[PDB]
Amino acid sequence: ILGGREAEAHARPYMASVQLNGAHLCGGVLVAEQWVLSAAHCLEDAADGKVQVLLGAHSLSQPEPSKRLYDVLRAVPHPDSQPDTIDHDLLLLQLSEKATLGPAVRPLPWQRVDRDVAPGTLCDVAGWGIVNHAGRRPDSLQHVLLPVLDRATCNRRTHHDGAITERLMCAESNRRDSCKGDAGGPLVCGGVLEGVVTSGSRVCGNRKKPGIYTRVASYAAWIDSVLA
């Protein structure tokens, strides 16, 4: 997260760190007791590496009573995801067992009604991604509040030039933004999950290249099918 601040510890009990061989890789969001939603291109990461999900965390490295690292029973990328597109960029991770819930670990309600978030709505995104241009990785969860950007502005040639489908949404990226390591994390508006950070290549913190988020409401039936 660029231009953000350290998050209040455990105030986002839905937040997940998706890990590969014990290192933070991507964000994710607990959407059911046994299921974490993240981004498909994260799993281009990779092969038969050990994918795990850390719940209940603030610090990646330090002991905390609520921290628990879960193994992953099954990883389910969206079937229409492709290496060279930002479309359908969702991944569902089935934990080894249902997560132990408490004040620091709880699924987030997610949007089922397929209607766009209003322009200007202030939403929250959080992550353990890089915090400066050098690539410094934070030990603790960061977040930033970002206003939703209307799709037509986002689709201008100066911006993302037609790439923002009805299944995608944008937020402003003026110095404050998600960046490398934040893919798959949650964009939360009014206490409800609305978006998942996409995991394609994108400059960070340039107002001319808004953040792009997959609209979870667009994929409600798919999420239900996988969890069935």
UniProtKB/Swiss-Prot annotation:
GO molecular function annotation: serine-type endopeptidase activity; serine-type peptidase activity
UniProt entry tagged with the keyword Cytoplasm: no
Protein name: Complement factor D
Any single Pfam family the record assigns to this protein: Trypsin
Domain notes for this protein: The self-inhibition loop inihibits the serine protease activity in absence of factor B (CFB) substrate.
Keyword Electron transport tagged: no
Family of this protein: Belongs to the peptidase S1 family.
Involvement in disease: Complement factor D deficiency: An immunologic disorder characterized by increased susceptibility to bacterial infections, particularly Neisseria infections, due to a defect in the alternative complement pathway.
Gene label: CFD
Gene Ontology BP annotations: complement activation; complement activation, alternative pathway; protein maturation; proteolysis; response to bacterium
EC number: 3.4.21.46
A Gene Ontology term for the protein's cellular component: extracellular exosome
Organism taxonomic ancestry: Eukaryota, Metazoa, Chordata, Craniata, Vertebrata
Catalytic activity of the protein: Selective cleavage of Arg-|-Lys bond in complement factor B when in complex with complement subcomponent C3b or with cobra venom factor
Modifications made to the protein after synthesis: CFD is activated by the removal of 5 residues at the N-terminus, named activation peptide, by the MASP-3 isoform of MASP1.
Domain Peptidase S1: 1-228
Active site, UniProt feature: H41 (charge relay system), D89 (charge relay system), A183 (charge relay system)
Self-inhibitor loop, as annotated region: 198-202
Function: Serine protease that initiates the alternative pathway of the complement system, a cascade of proteins that leads to phagocytosis and breakdown of pathogens and signaling that strengthens the adaptive immune system. In contrast to other complement pathways (classical, lectin and GZMK) that are directly activated by pathogens or antigen-antibody complexes, the alternative complement pathway is initiated by the spontaneous hydrolysis of complement C3.
